[PDB]
Structure 1
Amino acid sequence: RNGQLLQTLTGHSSSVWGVAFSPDGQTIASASDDKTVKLWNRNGQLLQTLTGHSSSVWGVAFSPDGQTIASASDDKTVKLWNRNGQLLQTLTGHSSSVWGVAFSPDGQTIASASDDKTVKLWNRNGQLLQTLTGHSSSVWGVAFSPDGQTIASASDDKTVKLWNRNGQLLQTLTGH
């Protein structure tokens, strides 16, 4: 199934988060060079353009059911979109570029990874639930455990950290 967590546990600072494939494998989403996210099918047919961010989009993810898309931007926000292109929510609270984003397995929680050295957890109504503090540099990747109760973050500080939903730091994995 989803390789985000393997990639966050073992991947490099340079791992690329601006392309995502839908869970059914039929749709590709790409953070494009024009402040949009574009969706296309495997034949190459353009399906949708997600317009709203005011600067570069760096991270994209699909919800586990494929119906919601999250985009992470240099504009310091995450935006949530329906696959028909409508903007559903803007998640405000990071203080710098947002590099990466992930959905929880149940689709109800969003995690974001920012240049501000934090991961933030959010619900779909756009409310901030938790801020995970401790990395000493920009956070480039984030993922959930398969049961959705542990969050993994990966940072330019060369560590991976494991956290629970109440913000407790469970483990730091060093040499990354």
Structure 2
Amino acid sequence: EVLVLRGTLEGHNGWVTSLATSAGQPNLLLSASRDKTLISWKLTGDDQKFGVPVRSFKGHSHIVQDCTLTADGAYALSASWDKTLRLWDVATGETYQRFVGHKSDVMSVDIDKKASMIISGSRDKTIKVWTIKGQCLATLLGHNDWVSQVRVVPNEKADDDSVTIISAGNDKMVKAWNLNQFQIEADFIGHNSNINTLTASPDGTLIASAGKDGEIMLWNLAAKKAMYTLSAQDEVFSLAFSPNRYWLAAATATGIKVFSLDPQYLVDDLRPEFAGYSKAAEPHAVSLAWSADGQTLFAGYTDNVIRVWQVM
């Protein structure tokens, strides 16, 4: 199966710094960008248009770094450089609760299962965990450099015994936290440059981390070991795991590369053409996420476009 051209989505005035989807509505797509706003999209499944935005969310005073959606497809969360987090709904905009207390920018926010609490990795070398009322119940330290990306793991069992989160900063080392005890459990060392993205597999066992040197090296936090390392030979910006089938995608500087990780080869080396842009550096994807069905992959490029790749 080959990912091909489907359409482009023009709804921003900046780099699409985040893409997120929910299983409640397959036609929804939340997109945070550099223009201090969030654009929710509506998909129709057609030619190059692919559909229209539904709601535009405003209220952040700086670059909205990371956006995420809950399971129901209604509530949304945004991490922006204005030292605050905002909780929205896709119905009428309508920021429910702000989350202030960080002394600097916050990179990544993440919602736990059953909308229970939220974690947030910021640029003040802290991982703040917040309630939905706006109360930061816990603050976690221990990172020497400021964190670049945090994520929760998807528990395969429906809340078996506990939930855990993972952290990745510019300190070439990956932390693994259990916020039930607010304790550190695993230091993951082996990176040679600053880590800028990490992603956990939907199976809840595999962790892929990658940085400026462009290596994508794997961990299994169930066994707390390291499997291997494979490189895209250029800087990589974001990673994404397919929810249904065994693929791993990487948003590189030269373009996008999707990996079939069971026999571990490259697939097609996605290189779209942008009608010129020859003299300077070509635009590249900065944030990407697989859809709920897994047959469509959205990628946020720098030139104001969310591009969709779909298997045939």
Q: When the two structures are superposed, what TM-score results if normalisation uses the length of structure 1?
A: 0.84
Root-mean-square deviation (CA), in Å?
A: 1.9
> 58, 62, 65: which is aligned to 2:107?
58
Query: Which residue is 1:150 aligned to?
Result: 206
Residues 158 and 79 of structure 1, relative CA distance in 2, 3 Å threshold: same
Say if 2:136 is the partner of 1:87: yes
> 166, 169, 172: which is aligned to 2:226?
169
Q: Cα deviations across residues 41-92 of structure 1 (Å, max 9, x unaligned)?
A: 1120011111111111111111132222111111001111122222122121
Q: Cα deviations across residues 98-121 of structure 1 (Å, max 9, x unaligned)?
A: 111111113611001101111100
The whole-number CA distance in structure 1 between the counterparts of 2:125 and 2:224 is 21
Give matches, 1:126-137, under 5 Å: 126-137=182-193
Give matches, 1:60-139, under 5 Å: 60-106=109-155, 108-124=163-179, 125-139=181-195
List gaps (5 residues or longer) in structure 1.
4-15
SS for the counterpart of 1:65 is helix
Query: Which residue is 1:18 aligned to?
Result: 66
SS for the counterpart of 2:97 is strand
Say if 2:93 is the partner of 1:44: yes
Aligned residue pair count: 163
Q: Is the 8 A contact 2:65 2:78 kept in 1?
A: no
Q: Is the 8 A contact 1:24 1:66 kept in 2?
A: no
Q: Cα deviations across residues 108-147 of structure 1 (Å, max 9, x unaligned)?
A: 1100110111110000121000111111111122222222
Q: Percent identical across equivalent pairs? A: 39
